[PDB]
Design an enzyme around this catalytic site. Structure first.
Site, PDB file in Angstrom:
ATOM      1  N   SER B 102     127.645   0.998  25.999  1.00  0.00           N
ATOM      2  CA  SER B 102     126.976   2.301  26.066  1.00  0.00           C
ATOM      3  C   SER B 102     127.730   3.128  24.694  1.00  0.00           C
ATOM      4  O   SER B 102     127.524   2.540  23.639  1.00  0.00           O
ATOM      5  CB  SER B 102     127.346   3.292  27.201  1.00  0.00           C
ATOM      6  OG  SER B 102     126.358   4.238  27.618  1.00  0.00           O
ATOM      7  N   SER B 103     128.019   4.233  24.756  1.00  0.00           N
ATOM      8  CA  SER B 103     128.973   4.825  23.638  1.00  0.00           C
ATOM      9  C   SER B 103     129.909   3.989  23.052  1.00  0.00           C
ATOM     10  O   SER B 103     130.103   4.119  21.711  1.00  0.00           O
ATOM     11  CB  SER B 103     129.576   6.378  23.782  1.00  0.00           C
ATOM     12  OG  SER B 103     130.303   6.345  25.028  1.00  0.00           O
ATOM     13  N   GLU B 126     124.538  -2.978  25.938  1.00  0.00           N
ATOM     14  CA  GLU B 126     123.756  -1.574  26.395  1.00  0.00           C
ATOM     15  C   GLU B 126     124.039  -0.433  25.382  1.00  0.00           C
ATOM     16  O   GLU B 126     124.638   0.688  26.118  1.00  0.00           O
ATOM     17  CB  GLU B 126     123.825  -1.299  27.889  1.00  0.00           C
ATOM     18  CG  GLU B 126     123.482  -2.324  28.780  1.00  0.00           C
ATOM     19  CD  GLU B 126     123.453  -2.268  30.179  1.00  0.00           C
ATOM     20  OE1 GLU B 126     123.969  -1.376  30.637  1.00  0.00           O
ATOM     21  OE2 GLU B 126     122.541  -3.008  30.859  1.00  0.00           O
ATOM     22  N   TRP B 180     131.192  14.724  28.906  1.00  0.00           N
ATOM     23  CA  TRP B 180     130.128  13.499  28.620  1.00  0.00           C
ATOM     24  C   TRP B 180     128.881  14.310  28.362  1.00  0.00           C
ATOM     25  O   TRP B 180     128.282  14.124  27.225  1.00  0.00           O
ATOM     26  CB  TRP B 180     130.130  12.487  29.359  1.00  0.00           C
ATOM     27  CG  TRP B 180     129.212  11.540  29.084  1.00  0.00           C
ATOM     28  CD1 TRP B 180     129.616  10.458  28.323  1.00  0.00           C
ATOM     29  CD2 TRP B 180     127.776  11.392  29.429  1.00  0.00           C
ATOM     30  NE1 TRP B 180     128.134   9.811  27.920  1.00  0.00           N
ATOM     31  CE2 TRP B 180     127.142  10.534  28.565  1.00  0.00           C
ATOM     32  CE3 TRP B 180     127.040  12.361  30.244  1.00  0.00           C
ATOM     33  CZ2 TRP B 180     126.039  10.283  28.900  1.00  0.00           C
ATOM     34  CZ3 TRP B 180     125.769  12.005  30.407  1.00  0.00           C
ATOM     35  CH2 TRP B 180     124.913  10.933  29.737  1.00  0.00           C
ATOM     36  N   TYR B 184     127.587  14.015  24.418  1.00  0.00           N
ATOM     37  CA  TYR B 184     127.501  12.590  24.164  1.00  0.00           C
ATOM     38  C   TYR B 184     125.740  12.311  24.238  1.00  0.00           C
ATOM     39  O   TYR B 184     125.130  11.583  23.150  1.00  0.00           O
ATOM     40  CB  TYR B 184     127.862  11.648  25.260  1.00  0.00           C
ATOM     41  CG  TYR B 184     129.222  11.331  25.034  1.00  0.00           C
ATOM     42  CD1 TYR B 184     130.385  12.278  24.769  1.00  0.00           C
ATOM     43  CD2 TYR B 184     129.641   9.889  24.670  1.00  0.00           C
ATOM     44  CE1 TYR B 184     131.665  11.833  24.678  1.00  0.00           C
ATOM     45  CE2 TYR B 184     130.984   9.523  24.570  1.00  0.00           C
ATOM     46  CZ  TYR B 184     131.976  10.637  24.254  1.00  0.00           C
ATOM     47  OH  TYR B 184     133.400  10.080  23.972  1.00  0.00           O
ATOM     48  N   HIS B 238     125.508  -1.895  34.175  1.00  0.00           N
ATOM     49  CA  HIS B 238     126.074  -0.896  33.056  1.00  0.00           C
ATOM     50  C   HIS B 238     127.510  -1.048  33.068  1.00  0.00           C
ATOM     51  O   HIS B 238     128.432  -0.408  32.013  1.00  0.00           O
ATOM     52  CB  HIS B 238     125.721   0.491  33.160  1.00  0.00           C
ATOM     53  CG  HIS B 238     125.975   1.337  31.781  1.00  0.00           C
ATOM     54  ND1 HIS B 238     125.165   1.095  30.773  1.00  0.00           N
ATOM     55  CD2 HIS B 238     126.226   2.592  31.498  1.00  0.00           C
ATOM     56  CE1 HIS B 238     125.438   1.841  29.664  1.00  0.00           C
ATOM     57  NE2 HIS B 238     126.167   2.867  30.377  1.00  0.00           N
TER      58      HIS B 238
END
Ligand code: NA
Ligand code: NA
EC number: 3.1.1.-
Lengths: 264, 260
Positions: B102-103, B126, B180, B184, B238
């Site tokens: 992710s990030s 991802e 978040w 984000y 994820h």
């Protein structure tokens, strides 16, 4: 409002095809998935056929209302074999060129048409090409017919991504499918994936716009995304999974229409 | 022996970090929720394979929550990469094999592009590439926590393992969801360092989750393929380190060993 022609037509390869046509204009051909039943296109066929196209679809050889067909037509089936049969039915119907959609073995058929009969394809729209022999269905042919029908009905429903639309196909359709599941098991999964026309030499004779299902697990048609991207073929997702024409008929019809308009 | 400690870096962040093992450095960057306890199991498996593993809670998140607002607002891969290079400097990590989801993956790519001297090899998973279809984030914070905890659990692919992180972790995540949400999703996806010039300074091995819906990180498979970067699926979705800690650890170990 265009009306739907529903009829049958004989070809020289022995098949008595059940087919339907609606609309006027450039030809669009909708090839079924492996279960071979064109009633799954009924809703989007009206939409596409109102959008300036003549839409043709059919039950596949051996399946549903096209069940009067020689055994070779539904045994040891490959994209190349089905492509031959489709070109024969195009000839009988007077279809010179067409924009062709297909999912699963229908997509194998699209690729084989694009490779082997590029003169007959304006553009190809393959969806979820089978590229590997599936682990879970490794011995599906070896099971007893009632079990084949039950397990393959469950699998298909799970791959619909819209269980309510799938059921709403109705009892007539699901009764036809019952038998198709068996014939599909015997004739398709062992031969179809190895027939995929996914070489560089197959994929660039005519325009191809490739899709996979947005809601399918990434793992399932992963290699479709790899192949298309490696070959610089347009690839995107459609709503739903393996039966977008059932789960999301408006978005399906929009895709087919916008894509086909690119090449007019 | 797991070292658990804190350092204040020059960006003003009071980091909580952990280290375990001996050998070449492997850094495990969290996903956007920022909590390194999600790595607890696979960190020991990796460490026991002959690596020194470092992880940390992300700025503003969990036990790293004492930090200036700019470190958890308008967040980008590039900002997070800068911060993590300062952590590396302070801990004496010269080069590392870096994992992130992710990030965390945005940060891997920004490290590979911006700080190639410091990365042995990158392992993005991802990478966010599109803005989540954000105007609705002027909700109550409890609503945000509720809705983001539900999304995250649904992205775990192993809801029992997610729940098994335990109440201490979920109580930390509660406040992290809000930070978040505010910091984000508007800015991380655009920051993805996915131009050809970003992607070929160090070796990259890219992954996506086998069980995620195709659309979610579809564009990762496209980008990696276009660029001839190795791309494959991992089990789960994820949070592979949570759902499939053994397969996750094996992946990190085998991939890193390619480059030694
Ligand atoms: Na042509
Ligand atoms: Na390097």
């Amino acid at each position: 409002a265009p009306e739907r022609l529903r009829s049958t037509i004989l070809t020289k390869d022995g098949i008595n095809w059940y087919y339907e046509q609606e609309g006027s204009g450039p030809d669009v051909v909708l090839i079924p998935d492996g279960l071979g039943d064109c009633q799954m296109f009924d809703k989007p066929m009206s939409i596409i056929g109102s959008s300036g196209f003549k839409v043709t679809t059919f039950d596949m050889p051996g399946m549903s209302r096209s069940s009067s067909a020689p055994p070779e037509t539904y045994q040891d089936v490959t994209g190349q074999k089905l492509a031959n049969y489709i070109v024969t039915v195009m000839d009988q119907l007077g279809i010179k060129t067409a924009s062709v959609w297909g999912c699963s073995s229908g997509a194998s058929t699209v690729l084989a048409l694009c490779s082997g009969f590029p003169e007959r394809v304006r553009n190809g729209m393959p969806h979820e090409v089978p590229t590997a022999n599936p682990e879970n269905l490794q011995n599906i042919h070896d099971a007893d017919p009632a079990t084949i029908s039950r397990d393959m009905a469950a699998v298909s429903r799970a791959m619909s991504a819209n269980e309510e639309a799938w059921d709403a196909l109705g009892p007539e359709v699901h009764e036809r499918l019952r038998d198709n599941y068996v014939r599909w098991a015997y004739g398709y999964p062992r031969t179809i994936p190895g027939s995929a026309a996914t070489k560089t030499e197959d994929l660039h004779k005519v325009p191809i716009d490739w899709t996979v299902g947005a809601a399918g697990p990434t793992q399932v048609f992963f290699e479709n995304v790899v192949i298309a991207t490696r070959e610089s073929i347009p690839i995107k997702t459609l709503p739903g999974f393996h039966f977008p024409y059932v789960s999301h008929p408006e978005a399906f019809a929009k895709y087919v229409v916008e894509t086909t308009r690119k090449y007019l």
